[PDB]
Write an enzyme that holds these catalytic residues in place. Structure first.
Site, PDB file in Angstrom:
ATOM      1  N   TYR C 119       1.178  -1.333  -0.604  1.00 15.56           N
ATOM      2  CA  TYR C 119      -0.046  -0.152   0.083  1.00 15.56           C
ATOM      3  C   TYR C 119       0.801   1.470   0.433  1.00 15.56           C
ATOM      4  O   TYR C 119       0.938   2.405  -0.778  1.00 15.56           O
ATOM      5  CB  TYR C 119      -1.048   0.007   1.722  1.00 15.56           C
ATOM      6  CG  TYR C 119      -2.116  -1.168   0.668  1.00 15.56           C
ATOM      7  CD1 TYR C 119      -3.418  -0.671  -0.325  1.00 15.56           C
ATOM      8  CD2 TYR C 119      -2.491  -2.272   1.129  1.00 15.56           C
ATOM      9  CE1 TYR C 119      -3.886  -1.364  -0.146  1.00 15.56           C
ATOM     10  CE2 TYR C 119      -2.979  -2.877   1.790  1.00 15.56           C
ATOM     11  CZ  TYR C 119      -4.455  -2.730   0.269  1.00 15.56           C
ATOM     12  OH  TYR C 119      -5.064  -3.806  -0.049  1.00 15.56           O
ATOM     13  N   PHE C 390     -10.275  -3.470  11.579  1.00 20.33           N
ATOM     14  CA  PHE C 390     -11.619  -3.580  10.404  1.00 20.33           C
ATOM     15  C   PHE C 390     -10.506  -3.990   9.075  1.00 20.33           C
ATOM     16  O   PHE C 390     -11.624  -4.013   7.885  1.00 20.33           O
ATOM     17  CB  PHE C 390     -12.058  -2.330   9.759  1.00 20.33           C
ATOM     18  CG  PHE C 390     -10.598  -1.651   9.714  1.00 20.33           C
ATOM     19  CD1 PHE C 390     -10.691  -0.751   8.358  1.00 20.33           C
ATOM     20  CD2 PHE C 390     -10.151  -0.075  10.585  1.00 20.33           C
ATOM     21  CE1 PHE C 390      -9.891   0.534   7.831  1.00 20.33           C
ATOM     22  CE2 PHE C 390      -9.580   0.844  10.060  1.00 20.33           C
ATOM     23  CZ  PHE C 390      -9.342   1.795   9.221  1.00 20.33           C
TER      24      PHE C 390
HETATM   25  F1  LIG Z   1     -19.768  -6.229   3.265  1.00 22.29           F
HETATM   26  C1  LIG Z   1     -18.380  -6.094   4.190  1.00 22.29           C
HETATM   27  C2  LIG Z   1     -17.689  -4.398   4.644  1.00 22.29           C
HETATM   28  C3  LIG Z   1     -16.905  -4.808   5.799  1.00 22.29           C
HETATM   29  C4  LIG Z   1     -16.403  -5.347   6.024  1.00 22.29           C
HETATM   30  N1  LIG Z   1     -15.123  -5.379   7.000  1.00 22.29           N
HETATM   31  N2  LIG Z   1     -15.178  -6.010   7.962  1.00 22.29           N
HETATM   32  C5  LIG Z   1     -13.477  -6.976   7.579  1.00 22.29           C
HETATM   33  C6  LIG Z   1     -12.626  -7.564   8.809  1.00 22.29           C
HETATM   34  C7  LIG Z   1     -11.390  -7.168   9.120  1.00 22.29           C
HETATM   35  C8  LIG Z   1     -10.760  -7.928  10.357  1.00 22.29           C
HETATM   36  C9  LIG Z   1     -11.716  -7.967  11.704  1.00 22.29           C
HETATM   37 CL1  LIG Z   1     -10.795  -8.220  12.959  1.00 22.29          CL
HETATM   38  C10 LIG Z   1     -13.051  -7.550  11.659  1.00 22.29           C
HETATM   39  C11 LIG Z   1     -13.797  -7.360   9.818  1.00 22.29           C
HETATM   40  C12 LIG Z   1     -17.007  -6.588   5.703  1.00 22.29           C
HETATM   41  C13 LIG Z   1     -17.260  -6.899   4.781  1.00 22.29           C
END
Ligand SMILES: Fc1ccc(N/N=C/c2ccc(Cl)cc2)cc1
Ligand SMILES: Fc1ccc(N/N=C/c2ccc(Cl)cc2)cc1
Ligand SMILES: Fc1ccc(N/N=C/c2ccc(Cl)cc2)cc1
Ligand SMILES: Fc1ccc(N/N=C/c2ccc(Cl)cc2)cc1
Ligand SMILES: Fc1ccc(N/N=C/c2ccc(Cl)cc2)cc1
Lengths: 390, 390, 390, 390, 390
Positions: C119, C390
């Site tokens: 990135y 996230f």
């Molecule tokens: F439709 C979506 C919108 C946003 C997302 N992000 N989530 C991704 C995510 C990454 C790390 C953890 Cl520990 C937990 C969740 C996933 C699906």
């Protein structure tokens, strides 16, 4: 201890012995699916009453060199109770099933061995070789010469028809190929589901002429394990490996393949495809030497030649090979080649060279020219592979 | 950065680069022994002055199929200073030595590769396969058919003559065999001494027609490592393995051998001879395609056939193979087989099948009959082995 | 391959790519909860039809030095099909989302990187540092000076309100703090349940001004893992660590914290708090240099100073810093400081020193006094921490 | 293959077989020191000429219960060439030495076994038990009741006299004790030197009534290994362990001791003295049942009792035990106790209970009262220990 | 912090503390089954309100030497909140339960210790020894003398009655034996079920006079773990081990047994039964010295003797032992033997020798004859075993 065909009453005792005998036990429901492949009189049990011994065979279709399909008796579910070791129960069960298999008209029997030191004595020889490759895919670059987006990432359950059609083309072309019946496709696409506390979800890579089923390892989250890759063309094989090397979150891809897998040659560094494991796959027992020797194709390169083959306690035959075909007839003439039945099973699909078995004296002749001709004749144009464990 | 033949003044700088470049560095005294195999003008250095690049070749004698011995240039001591990576020094040194090797009249060059992804581009193909077997000797039982006390346990230093005579018979009979000169026997029997804080003492098992040198591992005191086993007859090979399985204080015997080693077949349980490691051994560069193709023997089994072989940037030839011999002549006729020079080196000793390289598209033809004939013709009656690393 | 906003029809294909792309995949139900944080036009997909590429951003609130909260676009769910590597799909998706993010009025974008080498090229710089501490708690004694039973052992599900209120106070005070919306508290307290064959049950340690969530490791039953510790006062932080060192059945407590965690200093032996792991946490892309530079607080210690900052392909600005505030205005005057956009993101929360980036030449100036002033001005009074992935 | 006493000419062949047979081979100079303990006609060799078999015995003095010292034949240097396994060479050599040992007047023979499954058949039973304790000394606190600076840290080479005097008092008081002759003290204090690339330097802890020799492990630099601890009083034993627990740079102290070592009971946490390893130490063959049974002391607690003991192919005896003494006389009366000779050797020093061997049916009687009386009578007041390996 | 008997309202708080305190927590339903063994006033809690401390005892029946069964208070579910370490909560709870146990009329209390350094101070001494044996069953051969198909492989759930009857005979004959009530058989045969992501299915080996419950390890699929083997005769014990050595798919069988397990002696190679682990099993606190000393049987071998035993802060007694019985009466006469209460608990079942504790000065006398007599008298004819953890 008496030996007989099981009744419907015997099957809970057989499942108990199975559960105690096989750690990878598929379970009673999966076992009832496999039972559909067991012919009437395909099973024996020993009662002391409780089941202390069992063995059965399944009706299979094995592809041998020359794209010839043989009816094949697949021995499986062979178990002796830990309470009844060293009482000759395996010898008694193997003798009874072999009698039935021979009388039924099967030219060959086959099995997968739990240990390597057991089935030689009952005439089984290891006939295919499993070769695990592990690719460190972080370093993997395809060679300028390698063929090649025709591959799709898909859910296995949604493309059964396509897998079935590719596999059917695969198994008819390759020595070691087995017909895979509907019940085994039912069982395969059920193991493709994620299990709570067990295996992770399976994905498929789907080409018009090939597929790969893979899943991330339970514990090693940087290892992808390819459970099955079936490719009918070189283009499909290369395309599927381009897609697998594109699993950028993995460090390593492993597959159980065969010694002649061209994957190492697709890469600029052949060494990246490390051989991490090797083992005997399918074992063969030639039930009928003449029917088996006449049924397979032979290499058209070697000129017509004749010899006398003796199998120990298995007959003596005038063997004539020419134009890719063999004629095998009874004779009392002096033997030029002698070998135990297991040795013949090891030669039969082309995985082992006659001259290698001769060097260990498993195969005796006083003519080194004849050894060279056997080697060349029993060779398989298409490399021998292992279809699925049973 | 200029490229030239080293003077006597250059050799301390070359030893410094060697020491920094090779962890297994034999040291200055051992290196001076190997220097005796380097012809006048067999070495190049790059100076910036200090040595930042070196490469040399040794005069070797390589056995190829048909028991034919070729003069062979063995590339070795190839190193670029970590201060001068990515400045084309290896390409410049390899180009200069290849010019000298070709002008000198060598039909082939050979090397052992530190990495698998480097020498393909300079026309070298992996030509032999190393196969480590590990035997859990506590379970090992010889088969009723296995041959066989003709073997003696001896001190290596006291039986040099006998080792030399057996090895000399071995290397003339086996593709991959190398003449081992006096200086390399001097070096071998010096590594047979126990070193304080290093390798343990070596023992020999001596048969009239074979020997094995082995030592207990430094750290794993239940592992015996066979450094070298040379057996001219099957009796010798089996006798030596009976003696090694009799090392009752070891759990495991390991050896680096070849894929066709008959050891697994000597045992009742073939699985006890586990393949624990596999790697490319000797790499070959065919310097002169016609001289190399005409020099080796071919399999007498395949009938006379003719084709047109093109090597990329290496010529086009009318290739006629019959009665175990090849005639290779210039032509401008349409090519029926195309391949890079490295691919030819991989086919040359019989370790890789033409049909396996074709499946990876390293070798292109539109005739599958021709592929089968190449496969059968380039096959070696005697399995290809790896003599010693250089 | 065309690029567009996903329809409701696209989301099963996106979940398939997610499942194949992310081993830690939260699953379709958890993903639908996170979708609530994705604005209309926050997502892009690439179709070949099937989904071969996806990326989205979430509406987040990031705390920066001076207790200032910025609207922040959190990139997530970024995946390219293993069948479509090396076709520029990531570059195309990142360019489209960055256009939308910039037009929408976000001053910064953020992400958590799966790999460190990706990135930087899209202008993201690592802005926080994760620091794992492992305490051998069998040896741990608190220092005479350490503060301090105000801590209760509780079931997480029963004290949500109290966790939410503490976290809300925590995230407003700390650079790196993120608003945690209701759906993410729903998801957090669901991961606190024991799973059959997965993670063990979570417990909470609850103080008026702090909480810790911890669970025993699945396999290592003498390791307690602190998933989250939020402490608004030093008393709370010390009290919570007194309670965790009181887990007398554990040998080791591990936590992922930040480099300035005072835990080592609470103990008589600072060495017992071993740093076992370090990694980049949050990555920042400064979308609008002037809005971002003017929005954060600066250290009141450094006297008023002025310079000219150029960001490569990102503008040139007259930057005046005094009384903890910056004014950033357009200029064509000679640059005194040059750096790529990613470097600015790395400086922005105070985790990396300008003089450290200058030593690697990621940041160029010919005034070492100006370097010292940037270092002191961009420093954060409150140490920067990492809120949640996230 | 003939069997004879070795000549001076035979000893280089014997050293070669030793070197190939024993990884821990002491070497030719150390072996020549041990040879001083081998009586004239104490050795046999088998020639095929070269040495393919050897065995010898040393003249030793073994302490048995009641502080009685027996002349003891210590079998050692027993080796069969790996070229001559399974030819009965060990049976032939053991039979010849046993004939000589019996004719010479030795009541018992002893050895240390390389494997546990070999010497039972030649009448040897395991008679002592080795017990490795590993102490995590970071947690170790002495109990309020534990005795106790009377201990000095010293160089072993400088306090030989003091070690010799303590050991001499130790070996006369303890069953399993062996006289240690001058040559073995020469060998012990030479192994106390640091070797380049081998063992580190040895230190001694010296008390008026005890000593400990210890060294840091070669690889694990937080492990101290106690090679030898000899303590004649409980005060000395406790004092030496206070000093060893004071090695503040070590995490762990290990020692090979006996099952009744009181160390665990010196600590507040008995569990800190972990048993990490257990094995048979000294094996005994009772050559003369009456001379051996009459020579040792018996427990004064059990009242006078009489029985008839049969040893399989070893005689039948009227055995009368009272006032700590036994009378053992020939009889043809019905046997009340039967056992193989090896079982008797296992009972003889008090390490194994008659009732434990009876539960495995190694010892048969129909009187459970007689079993209880044998158990109590053959018990040793002083716990049996293992002196030194030979 | 006040100490009181729990109300029905307290039990969810107690389950929370249990869950946080015990990784192997049986769970609320299993805990409610065990609660049936807790008498009215068998439990204490400390409230700060929330539960920060708990301890209880169960009504048990312990077999001691002479086949005598004692009412025994089994301490369990002892936990202090990690928030309330070092506030004397354990000392306060142990003092209150000991008062209740003593007033209730229990002669002994028992427990299983989570750590070895805790319960000595409250008068508990380790009274049994756990000994893990691991058998490499691939090498295991039974001795010619070993007894012995009377053993059946069965499903545990289907043979509860038979297990219960064998265990009941076992526990009445063996010191350390505990009555196992119905609720604990309910709990045992529920742990015999395969759990998704947890333990595999349990099998039983059933003899008329013995049973073994075993399961394959979760991760090590070549290890069988025997959870329980109860054998009332030597024939049963040997028969069950013949069946376990017949698990031909396993490399290793492990069992937690006692130091006098005769298994090693059943084999030709005693060494194959490796001791891999040793630990204190049951701990005893003698509540009433006279009632406990008079209740057990003593060895009939030692002649009548009299002494004066003082227990520190536990009384002084004239102790007369003869004809296997003891009379223990109050006296103010000079003590001949002194020891802490914990030491007595360690002697009581015969696991530790008085002379071993004396060597560590845990037990003081100036008469070595008296030491020998105590040793012989407190010895157990039947070896002490460990029934089940509580
Ligand atoms: F439709 C979506 C919108 C946003 C997302 N992000 N989530 C991704 C995510 C990454 C790390 C953890 Cl520990 C937990 C969740 C996933 C699906
Ligand atoms: F009734 C039965 C008939 C045949 C059978 N064979 N199946 C055995 C088997 C072996 C290996 C695998 Cl990977 C899967 C299944 C099992 C039960
Ligand atoms: F001057 C020199 C000329 C040739 C050389 N080659 N030797 C290199 C070499 C490589 C491998 C081994 Cl196992 C042993 C030696 C080394 C120095
Ligand atoms: F000639 C000889 C006579 C006797 C011998 N026995 N020594 C063998 C031996 C065994 C173990 C140790 Cl730790 C040390 C030495 C060795 C040679
Ligand atoms: F209310 C209760 C009363 C008694 C108890 N003791 N059980 C504790 C326990 C300990 C070890 C095992 Cl392997 C199984 C269970 C647990 C709860």
């Amino acid at each position: 201890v008496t030996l007989c065909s099981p009744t419907e009453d015997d099957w809970p005792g057989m499942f108990l012995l199975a559960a105690a005998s096989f750690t990878d036990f598929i379970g009673p429901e999966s076992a009832t699916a496999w039972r559909t492949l067991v012919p009437t009189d395909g099973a024996v049990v020993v009662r002391d009453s409780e089941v202390v011994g069992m063995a059965l065979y399944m009706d299979l279709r094995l592809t041998v060199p020359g794209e010839v399909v043989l009816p094949t008796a697949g021995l499986s579910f062979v178990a002796v109770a830990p309470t009844h070791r060293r009482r000759g129960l395996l010898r008694a069960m193997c003798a009874e099933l072999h009698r039935r298999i021979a009388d039924s008209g099967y030219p060959v029997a086959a099995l997968h061995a739990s240990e390597g030191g057991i089935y030689g004595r009952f005439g089984y020889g290891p006939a295919t070789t499993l070769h695990e490759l592990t690719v460190d895919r972080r370093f993997a670059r395809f060679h300028a010469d390698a063929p090649g987006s025709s591959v799709r990432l898909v859910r296995p359950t949604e493309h059964r028809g396509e897998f079935e059609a590719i596999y059917e083309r695969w198994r008819q072309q390759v020595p070691g190929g087995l017909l895979r019946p509907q019940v085994l496709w039912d069982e395969l696409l059920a193991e493709a589901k994620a299990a709570p506390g067990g295996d992770r979800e399976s994905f498929a890579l789907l080409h018009p002429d090939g597929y790969a089923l893979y899943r991330v390892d339970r514990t090693d989250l940087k290892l992808a394990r390819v459970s099955e890759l079936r490719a009918v063309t070189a283009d499909a094989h290369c395309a599927l490996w381009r897609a697998l090397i594109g699993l950028d979150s993995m460090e390593r891809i492993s597959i159980i393949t065969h010694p002649q897998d061209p994957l190492p040659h697709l890469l600029t560094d052949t060494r990246l495809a490390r051989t991490t494991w090797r083992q005997d796959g399918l074992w063969l027992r030639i039930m009928n030497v003449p029917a088996a020797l006449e049924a397979r194709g032979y290499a058209h390169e070697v000129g017509e030649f004749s010899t006398v083959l003796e199998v120990s306690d298995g007959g003596r035959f005038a063997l004539k090979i020419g134009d890719g075909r063999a004629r095998c007839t009874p004779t009392d003439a002096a033997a030029e080649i002698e070998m135990d039945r297991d040795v013949l099973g090891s030669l039969y699909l082309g995985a082992h060279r006659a001259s290698t078995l001769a060097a260990a004296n498993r195969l005796r002749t006083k003519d080194s020219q004849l050894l060279r001709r056997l080697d060349a004749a029993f060779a398989s144009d298409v490399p021998v592979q292992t279809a699925f464990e049973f």
